[PDB]
């Protein structure tokens, strides 16, 4: 349509918000697949940023593919190589969630401002498999990667 099409020429990025992501308790409800940007290029954001970003985009695309097999076939039909990437993806998509400073008056969680350097290092270490021993609950609603380790300890130190 002319209206959006004319507007699309000027846009440098998009931020898609899905209810499907919001219903899974993942806030902010940013769809990691459908959201894109023009500056996602190794020349602009560096080679380290591009590969770590494309790595998270690949494992999520493979996760959504492998998840469709679970419903129709089952968990037993998936190999160990597949289930390894599925487990890491569930931690990845939970680590994308973040508590905000605006929503401190609501609920009761302290907001976080994660730097760019800590975001790249955080997700890169998950893809390599440095936090496979930790559970999925530790990555839910945290700032940097350090709080994922600190929450996992404080959670595991009780029961």
């Amino acid at each position: 349509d002319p209206a959006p099409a004319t507007t699309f020429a000027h846009l440098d990025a998009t931020t898609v918000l899905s209810r499907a992501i919001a219903e899974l308790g993942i806030y902010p409800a940013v769809d990691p697949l459908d959201s894109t940007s023009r500056i996602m290029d190794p020349n602009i954001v560096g080679s380290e940023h591009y590969d770590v970003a494309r790595g998270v985009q690949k494992i999520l695309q493979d996760y959504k593919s492998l998840q469709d097999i679970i419903a129709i076939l089952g968990m037993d039909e998936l190999s160990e190589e597949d289930k390894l990437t599925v487990s890491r993806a569930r931690k990845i998509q939970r680590f994308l969630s973040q508590p905000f400073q605006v929503a401190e008056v609501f609920t009761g969680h302290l907001g976080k401002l994660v730097p760019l350097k800590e975001t790249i290092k955080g997700f890169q270490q998950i893809l390599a498999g440095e936090y496979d021993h930790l559970p999925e609950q530790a990555f839910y609603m945290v700032g940097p990667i350090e709080e994922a380790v600190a929450k996992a300890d404080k959670l595991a130190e009780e029961h």
Binding site: M75, P135, L155
Partner: peptide, 19 residues
Amino acid sequence: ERYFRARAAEQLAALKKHH
């Protein structure tokens, strides 16, 4: 997430027994 509830519970139990 039945399967990953079992896996996450086993990992939490592993960390508890470790400490």
